[PDB]
Design an enzyme around this catalytic site. Sequence first.
Site, PDB file in Angstrom:
ATOM      1  CD  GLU A   1      15.530  30.348  47.019  1.00 25.86           C
ATOM      2  OE1 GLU A   1      15.353  31.241  47.887  1.00 25.86           O
ATOM      3  OE2 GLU A   1      16.799  30.266  46.515  1.00 25.86           O
TER       4      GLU A   1
ATOM      5  CE  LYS B   1      25.930  23.738  40.155  1.00 29.55           C
ATOM      6  NZ  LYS B   1      24.636  24.435  39.549  1.00 29.55           N
ATOM      7  CE1 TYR B   2      25.601  17.458  36.952  1.00 25.62           C
ATOM      8  CE2 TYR B   2      26.635  16.723  34.752  1.00 25.62           C
ATOM      9  CZ  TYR B   2      25.443  17.214  35.567  1.00 25.62           C
ATOM     10  OH  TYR B   2      24.393  17.178  34.874  1.00 25.62           O
TER      11      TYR B   2
ATOM     12  CG  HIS C   1      34.327  23.680  52.118  1.00 21.75           C
ATOM     13  ND1 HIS C   1      35.761  23.252  52.106  1.00 21.75           N
ATOM     14  CD2 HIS C   1      33.665  22.842  52.906  1.00 21.75           C
ATOM     15  CE1 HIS C   1      35.562  22.293  53.133  1.00 21.75           C
ATOM     16  NE2 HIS C   1      34.494  22.097  53.413  1.00 21.75           N
TER      17      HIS C   1
ATOM     18  CG  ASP D   1      29.018  22.044  70.635  1.00 21.83           C
ATOM     19  OD1 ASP D   1      28.024  21.374  70.483  1.00 21.83           O
ATOM     20  OD2 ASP D   1      28.941  23.066  71.640  1.00 21.83           O
TER      21      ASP D   1
ATOM     22  CB  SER E   1      27.741  21.185  42.572  1.00 23.15           C
ATOM     23  OG  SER E   1      26.374  21.486  42.880  1.00 23.15           O
ATOM     24  N   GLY E   2      25.863  19.374  41.672  1.00 26.95           N
ATOM     25  CA  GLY E   2      25.034  19.064  40.784  1.00 26.95           C
ATOM     26  C   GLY E   2      23.756  18.132  41.311  1.00 26.95           C
TER      27      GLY E   2
ATOM     28  CG  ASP F   1      17.816  12.408  37.967  1.00 23.46           C
ATOM     29  OD1 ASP F   1      17.306  13.025  39.177  1.00 23.46           O
ATOM     30  OD2 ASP F   1      18.288  13.338  37.169  1.00 23.46           O
TER      31      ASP F   1
ATOM     32  CB  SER G   1      56.822  30.172  49.182  1.00 24.17           C
ATOM     33  OG  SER G   1      57.138  28.975  49.853  1.00 24.17           O
TER      34      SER G   1
ATOM     35  CD  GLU H   1      18.728  18.078  41.082  1.00 23.81           C
ATOM     36  OE1 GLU H   1      17.917  17.661  40.272  1.00 23.81           O
ATOM     37  OE2 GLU H   1      19.775  17.770  41.303  1.00 23.81           O
ATOM     38  CD  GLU H   2      16.328  17.077  37.402  1.00 27.54           C
ATOM     39  OE1 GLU H   2      17.331  17.609  36.655  1.00 27.54           O
ATOM     40  OE2 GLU H   2      16.137  15.884  37.390  1.00 27.54           O
TER      41      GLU H   2
ATOM     42  CG  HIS I   1      15.778  15.909  43.170  1.00 27.12           C
ATOM     43  ND1 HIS I   1      15.009  16.119  41.874  1.00 27.12           N
ATOM     44  CD2 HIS I   1      16.899  15.255  42.863  1.00 27.12           C
ATOM     45  CE1 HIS I   1      15.852  15.444  40.804  1.00 27.12           C
ATOM     46  NE2 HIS I   1      17.139  14.889  41.760  1.00 27.12           N
TER      47      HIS I   1
HETATM   48  N1  LIG Z   1      20.912  17.523  38.731  1.00 26.84           N
HETATM   49  C1  LIG Z   1      20.393  18.284  37.773  1.00 26.84           C
HETATM   50  C2  LIG Z   1      20.551  19.848  38.149  1.00 26.84           C
HETATM   51  C3  LIG Z   1      21.942  20.173  38.693  1.00 26.84           C
HETATM   52  C4  LIG Z   1      22.235  21.930  38.577  1.00 26.84           C
HETATM   53  O1  LIG Z   1      21.257  22.489  38.399  1.00 26.84           O
HETATM   54  O2  LIG Z   1      23.226  21.897  39.489  1.00 26.84           O
HETATM   55  C5  LIG Z   1      21.175  18.272  36.324  1.00 26.84           C
HETATM   56  O3  LIG Z   1      22.287  17.536  36.535  1.00 26.84           O
HETATM   57  O4  LIG Z   1      20.859  18.573  35.210  1.00 26.84           O
HETATM   58 CA   LIG Z   2      16.994  32.864  47.088  1.00 35.12          CA
HETATM   59 ZN   LIG Z   3      18.356  13.961  40.318  1.00 38.13          ZN
HETATM   60 ZN   LIG Z   4      18.187  15.292  36.849  1.00 31.44          ZN
END
Ligand SMILES: N[C@@H](CCC(=O)O)C(=O)O
Ligand SMILES: [Ca+2]
Ligand SMILES: [Zn+2]
Ligand SMILES: [Zn+2]
EC number: 3.4.17.21
Lengths: 689, 689
Positions: free
Chosen positions: A373, A639-640, A629, A606, A457-458, A327, A568, A364-365, A317
Site C-alpha cells: 500500500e 509464489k516463493y 517485470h 540516471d 516473492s513472499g 520471522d 522462433s 506482511e503476513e 516487516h
Molecule cells: N511471508 C508470508 C506472506 C507472503 C505473501 O503473502 O506473499 C508467508 O510466506 O506466509
Molecule cells: Ca491497495
Molecule cells: Zn517474514
Molecule cells: Zn511469515
Amino acid sequence: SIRWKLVSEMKAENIKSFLRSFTKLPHLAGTEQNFLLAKKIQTQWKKFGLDSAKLVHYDVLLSYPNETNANYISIVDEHETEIFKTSPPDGYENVTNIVPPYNAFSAQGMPEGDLVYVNYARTEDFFKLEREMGINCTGKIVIARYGKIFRGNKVKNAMLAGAIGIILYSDPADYFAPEVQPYPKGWNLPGTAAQRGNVLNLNGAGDPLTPGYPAKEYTFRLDVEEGVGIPRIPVHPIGYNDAEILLRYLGGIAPPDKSWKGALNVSYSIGPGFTGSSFRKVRMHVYNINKITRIYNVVGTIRGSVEPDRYVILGGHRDSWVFGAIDPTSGVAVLQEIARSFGKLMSKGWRPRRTIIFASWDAEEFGLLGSTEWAEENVKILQERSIAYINSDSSIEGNYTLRVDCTPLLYQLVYKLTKEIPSPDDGFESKSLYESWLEKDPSPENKNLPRINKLGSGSDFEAYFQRLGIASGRARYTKNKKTDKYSSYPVYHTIYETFELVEKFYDPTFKKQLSVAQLRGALVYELVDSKIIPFNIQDYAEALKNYAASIYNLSKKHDQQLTDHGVSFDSLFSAVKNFSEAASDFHKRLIQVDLNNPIAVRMMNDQLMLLERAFIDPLGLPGKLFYRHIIFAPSSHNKYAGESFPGIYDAIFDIENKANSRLAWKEVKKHISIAAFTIQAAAGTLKEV
Amino acid sequence: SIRWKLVSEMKAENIKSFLRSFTKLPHLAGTEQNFLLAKKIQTQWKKFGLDSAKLVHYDVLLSYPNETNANYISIVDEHETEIFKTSPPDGYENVTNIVPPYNAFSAQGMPEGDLVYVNYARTEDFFKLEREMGINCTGKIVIARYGKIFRGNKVKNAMLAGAIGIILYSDPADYFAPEVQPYPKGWNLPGTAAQRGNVLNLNGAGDPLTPGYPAKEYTFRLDVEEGVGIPRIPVHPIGYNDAEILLRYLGGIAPPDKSWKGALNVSYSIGPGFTGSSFRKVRMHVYNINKITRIYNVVGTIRGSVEPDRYVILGGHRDSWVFGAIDPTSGVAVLQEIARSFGKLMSKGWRPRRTIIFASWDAEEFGLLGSTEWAEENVKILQERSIAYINSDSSIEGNYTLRVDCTPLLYQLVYKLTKEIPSPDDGFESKSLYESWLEKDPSPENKNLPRINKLGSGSDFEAYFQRLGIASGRARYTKNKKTDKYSSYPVYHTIYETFELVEKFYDPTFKKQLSVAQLRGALVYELVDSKIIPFNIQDYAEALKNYAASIYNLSKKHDQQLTDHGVSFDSLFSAVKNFSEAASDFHKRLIQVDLNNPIAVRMMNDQLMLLERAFIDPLGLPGKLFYRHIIFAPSSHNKYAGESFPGIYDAIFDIENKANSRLAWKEVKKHISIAAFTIQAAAGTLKEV
Ligand SMILES: N[C@@H](CCC(=O)O)C(=O)O
Ligand SMILES: [Ca+2]
Ligand SMILES: [Zn+2]
Ligand SMILES: [Zn+2]
Ligand SMILES: *[C@@H]1O[C@H](CO)[C@@H](O[C@@H]2O[C@H](CO)[C@@H](O)[C@H](O)[C@H]2NC(C)=O)[C@H](O)[C@H]1NC(C)=O
Ligand SMILES: *[C@@H]1O[C@H](CO)[C@@H](O[C@@H]2O[C@H](CO)[C@@H](O)[C@H](O)[C@H]2NC(C)=O)[C@H](O)[C@H]1NC(C)=O
Ligand SMILES: *[C@@H]1O[C@H](CO)[C@@H](O)[C@H](O)[C@H]1NC(C)=O
Ligand SMILES: *[C@@H]1O[C@H](CO)[C@@H](O)[C@H](O)[C@H]1NC(C)=O
Ligand SMILES: *[C@@H]1O[C@H](CO)[C@@H](O)[C@H](O)[C@H]1NC(C)=O
Ligand SMILES: *[C@@H]1O[C@H](CO)[C@@H](O)[C@H](O)[C@H]1NC(C)=O
Ligand SMILES: *[C@@H]1O[C@H](CO)[C@@H](O)[C@H](O)[C@H]1NC(C)=O
Ligand SMILES: *[C@@H]1O[C@H](CO)[C@@H](O)[C@H](O)[C@H]1NC(C)=O
Ligand SMILES: N[C@@H](CCC(=O)O)C(=O)O
Ligand SMILES: [Ca+2]
Ligand SMILES: [Cl-]
Ligand SMILES: [Cl-]
Ligand SMILES: [Zn+2]
Ligand SMILES: [Zn+2]
C-alpha cells in the site's frame, strides 16, 4: 572508512537485546501490541537521530478467527456422530492473546465429504492425480502437506481440482529434522503445533479491496465478495498428531511412489474414503472473519546532502503470527541496529549523498499489505527516484551459511561487501564472510563465485521489484541445502518461534545475525553514498544470456511444433546480443565520466537507476496486472520461487495439453516478441545517442 | 536575443516555396511518393546542419481501395435492377494515382436494405432515434452527414445501433460556406467531391495489429480479424450531389426539428424506406483491402550541450489523402522552415542546452500510426527524459486568428511568446500576435486572456500526451467560430486541398503561416534552451479547480442518487486543495534555487518535467488501455474533443439509463477515488521532503 565505521559499530549484543525486547508478547498485524511496537520503533529512530520517523496508516482487509465460533476438523460416522475433532511455550504461560492456528482469508463453511490425500498439492501432484492415478478431487475434502511451495498456491490448485475444502498439515518428513528433539528440548516441531499463514492468491495486488491504489480513508473498495485473491473454499491447518488420525484409515489406491509418502506411521493411501475403521466422512468447520482493520508502517528518513531526490530504501516487516522471533523479529532487531549505527555516523557529522528511507512494514503476513500500500501511495516519486530496495525480514533461518537473492545489478556489490565483513562461522575466524559463503554454497554457473538466487516473492520487496522495477536484494543466514531437507525451518509460523529458540539453538553468540546486519547496512551505505551508483550492467547482460539459453532449452522437446507453428527465438537472442553490446559500451563510457562534472555524473547515474525500470511493462503479465517485470516474476506454481522470462515460461508450460494448439503457440510467439522488445528497449536506454 | 534571431530568420516566402515543392503530387502513406518525400525532408535536414536525420520504419496495417473491384453505393428496384449508382483539380489533369474516395479500414461487404437518415450519427442522434422517434436502425443501411465529431465515432455508434452499413456524406450545411463559390472559383466544396478518412476506433492503440509494441519485423501480430478498432460493417463516403439523390425519396417520419435538416433541396425525412418513386432498396459495395505496408518516419536531432538526455520533440505528419496542401503539408512546410532556422543558429556556433528531436511522421491519416509506433519503440527513454512535444500538423485551417490547444503547464509560455511575434492580421500591423488573438478569441474563464483549449486527439501528440504524460501543445490559424459555422474547412480531406487553394484563398502573403512557424519554433527553443523549464504548475492547479467544479456541477441533477448511493466528491476537492498548496509551495521554492548549482537546478527541473507524468495511470481507463491520463482523455463520443476527468465523466454519462443503478454508482465512486488519489500523488511529487 565510513563504511568500516558503520559495520564495526554494529554489535551482536545490541541485536540480542533488541530481539529480546520485541519478542515478549505476540505482535499480530492489526492488534494493539503491534501498534505499540510501531511506536517503540519510532521512538528509537528519533533517539538515533533520524531526520523523520512517522506512522503511516492504511485500512486494509485482514482476517482473524472468531473467538466465539472456533474452527475445527472432525470425523463423523454414518449416524452423524462426531468420532474425532481436531483441537503457550514454557515461560509464556501468562500470555493471553496468542491467535489460534488458522489460515487467514479462508472461506467460511462447513463442508462434509470423502477425504483424498494430495501430497503437497503442487501443480504436478494434481496432474498426477488426474492424469495417472485415476483420482477425481471434485466434491472431495483434500488433505495436503505443507512444504515445497507457498500455501496459497496449494489452495488455488485444490480449488482448480474441484475440492470443497482443504486441510493443510505439517508432516514430520518436512518439518522434523533428523536427530533433533522437539521444542523445548530441541528446535523441532512438536506434533501438537500447526503452521499459520495466509492463503490468498494476490499476484502482487496488495490489500484485496483496493488493487492499484492505496487504502486511504476515502478510497473506493471492492465489495468483499470480489476482493482480489480470496479463496472460495475453507482452508485450515493442523499439526501432525491430528493429521495422523485423519490419514490412518484412508483407503483406495496405495501411494503411487515413495515421493508421496511422509514420515507418519500411516500408509499414505490416497482415498477417497476410509477402510478398516466409525470413520465415515470428514467435516471442516471454518468461520474466520474478514474485517477492514487499520495497519501502521513506520517510515523514517535521513535526507541526502547532494541528491535528496534519490532514495535507497531499507524496509522490513514487524508483524508476526505469534512471537515471530525468527520471522520477522530477527530482521526487526537487525533493522534497529542498522538505524542506530547510521545515527552514530550522523552524530559525528556525516550525512549521506542520497536519501535513506527506513521502513517498518505492517501486515506482511496478510499479503505484503503495508509495504505494497505504501508503494501504491508513493509510486510516482518511488519509480522516478529510487536507486534500490534492501529487505530486512528474518535474518536467521538456519546457521550454515549466507543466502542472497538479488537482481544481477547488485551481484558485484554483494561480492565486494562480503569480502570486507568478518565471517561469523566456526573455523573461519580470520576469514571473510565471502570466503565462508563461497566454500559452503558455490554457484552452479561459476564455481569460483558464491551462489546468488533470483528474486521471487513472499516478502516485502515484491511490489518494489516486480511492480515498480526498483533494483532489490535480500540476504539472510540459512540451512545447508545439501544436508538439510526439511522445508523453511521446523517451527516456522508456529507458537514456538521464541527468543529462547534463537538464542539456544540458532545463534547463541548473535554473530551470524550480526554479519547479516553488517551486510544489509553496508549495502544501503554503498548505494546511498557512492558518487557513481554501484551497479554492473554487464552482469545483467550475462544473466540474460543464461535465461535465454534456459527458455530455449525448455522449448527443444517441442521442436516439431515450433517449426509447424512458425515459432522462433531468433528475436530474443538478437535482443540479448544487442543488450550485451550496449552494456559493454555503457561501462566503457562510464569509466570516462568526468567525476567533477555534476551533470555528466547525474546523467550516467540516471541510466544506472532507470535500467531496471526498462523491464517493467505497464500491461502486466497475462491475468496479473501487478507483475510487470518481463525478466522475472514469482512462479505461477509457487509464489516463493522466481521464474525467468515468466511470459514465455507460462505460455509454453504444459502446452502439449492445451485444447487449441494453434492458439497456444500464438501465445508463445506473443511473449517471445514482448521479451525481445523489452530487452531491446532496455539496451536503448544505455545508448549515448 | 537568440530567440529573436530564430524567429526573425523564418520567412513567409520560404514556407511558400517548401509548400509548393511538396504538393505537386499525392503523398498517401505507404506509397512511393511519400517515401520520396521522406528522403527529400531527410536530405534537407542534413543540409540545414542537424546532427542526425534517419528513416525509421515500421510495417503496419494500412487500407486501400481495390483497383479492380471499385466501391459504390446503388439504389435497386424490386426487380433487382440498378436504378442509380454513386460514382483531378485544374492543373493536375496528368496526375494518375489520386486514390478514389473511400473510408480506410471499412469492412468488406455488399449489404442491402432500407435506408435511414441518422443526422450526424452522434451519440445524442442515436439516443433521439431510439428513445424519442420510434426508429430502430437494426438491419438498416444508415446515411449520416459528416461533421461535428470524428467519423470513426459515427461508425462505432452505427454499429451499436445495429446498422448493417453506413454511408457518410458532406452536407453543404456543414461544408459549404455562405456566399463562397466552389473550387476552383472559390474555396467551397463542389457537389462531386467526397471526404476521405479512416474509420477506426483505436483509442490510442496505434497499428491495429500490434497494440503496446512497435511494429518491427519480428513482432507478434494479432490476426487481422482481431485488429484493434476495425469496424465490422461497410462504410463509404459520397459527395452531396450523390447524397441528394439517395435522400430525396426517403419516407416515414418527418425530420424531428430543424437541427436534423441540412441544406440540400430534400425533406430530410428519416425513413426507413422510400416513398414517391423505382427506388426500393439501397446497396453498398465496399471491397477495400487491408495490407501490412512499410511506413517511414524521418527522425533527426540537435543534441544538447548541457543536458543531452532531455528532449523537446517537434513532430508533424507528412502523409496526406491526396495533395494535402493544408492537411498536413502546410505543417510540413512550417517544420522545414523551423529546422532551417535552427540550422542557421548552429552555423553561428549556437547549440541548445537540451536535445531537440525533429520528426516527420508517416501514416497519421491511418490512425496516428507512425508517431504512435515510434512512441511505443522509444517509450522507456521518452517517458524518463522528455520535456515536451510540440506538434506541426496543418498550420492554416482558416485565416481569422490563432487557435492553441495545450496542457496548463504551457499556458504562460504560450502567452509570453505570442507577445513577441508580430501579428500577421490586417489592421494589426504594429501589434503582436497576442494582441490580435486576445481581441478575436478571449477566454470564457478570463476575458483578459486569449482562449487556450484542452488537448483531445486526432493528431500525433496523442500517444505522447494521453499515453506517456509528456506535456504537449499545438497551434495553428483557424476560422472565426462566432461567424463561421461549417465543420473543419470545406475542402478537408478532398482532392481540392491544393497549393492554389492555400495561396489564393487562405493566406496569399504566407504571413499567417509564418506566424505559426515562429510560434511553434519559439516554443521548442524556450523549452530546449531555458535553464529552468518554463512550465507553471500554479496554472495547472487553477485548471484542476475549474475541472472539479465542472464535473461536480454535472452531478447536481443526480443529487438524490448521490445521497442514496453514498457518492461524494469531497476527496476530489480535497486533493485539488492539496495540489494547489503544493504548487504554490513549489513555485515559492523554485524562485530561490541557486542557478549556479547544477544539481539543485536539475532536481527542480526533474520535478517540472515529471509533473505531467504523475497523471498517467498504467491501468488505463475502462476499456482503453492506451488512454492513461486521468485528467484528460479524448471524448468517448468524439475523438477530436478533449474531456476532463474522463473516468468520472464516462461513469456518470447517461447514468439514469443504466440497468443496474447500484453497480453504476459504484463505478462513479471508483473513478472519483482514482482521480483524487492521482491528484494527491501528483502534489506529492512537488514536495520538498
Ligand atoms: N511471508 C508470508 C506472506 C507472503 C505473501 O503473502 O506473499 C508467508 O510466506 O506466509
Ligand atoms: Ca491497495
Ligand atoms: Zn517474514
Ligand atoms: Zn511469515
Ligand atoms: C539488434 O540490432 C540489430 C542491428 O541493428 C537489428 O538487426 C536488424 O534486424 C532487422 C530485422 O529485424 C533487419 O531488417 C536489419 O537488416 C538488421 N540490421 C543489421 C543486422 O545490421 C536487430 O533487429 C536488433 N534486435 C532487435 C530484437 O531489435
Ligand atoms: C489533503 O491533505 C489533508 C491534510 O493532510 C488530508 O486530510 C486528512 O484527511 C484524513 C481523511 O482522509 C483525516 O483522517 C485526517 O485527519 C486529515 N488531516 C488533516 C485535515 O490535517 C487529506 O486526506 C488530503 N487529501 C487527499 C485526497 O489525500
Ligand atoms: C462470530 O460467531 C458468532 C457465533 O456464530 C456470530 O454470532 C458472530 O456474528 C460472529 N462474528 C462476526 C464478526 O461475524
Ligand atoms: C469429476 O467429477 C465431477 C463431479 O462428480 C464430474 O463432473 C467430472 O466430469 C469428473 N471429471 C474428471 C474425472 O475429469
Ligand atoms: C546450529 O549450529 C550448530 C553447530 O553446527 C548445530 O549443531 C545446530 O544444529 C544448528 N542449529 C540449527 C537450528 O540448524
Ligand atoms: C481485388 O478484387 C479482385 C476482384 O474481386 C480480386 O480478384 C482480388 O483478389 C482483390 N485483391 C485483393 C488483394 O484482395
Ligand atoms: C430492433 O429490431 C431488431 C431486429 O428486427 C429487434 O431484435 C430488436 O428487438 C429491436 N429493438 C429495439 C426497438 O430496441
Ligand atoms: C481569408 O481572409 C479574407 C479577408 O478577411 C476573407 O475574405 C476570406 O474569406 C478568408 N478565407 C477563408 C478561406 O476563410
Ligand atoms: N487526423 C486524421 C486521423 C485521426 C485519427 O485517426 O485519430 C483524421 O482526423 O482523419
Ligand atoms: Ca504497435
Ligand atoms: Cl530479508
Ligand atoms: Cl498542429
Ligand atoms: Zn493532419
Ligand atoms: Zn487529415
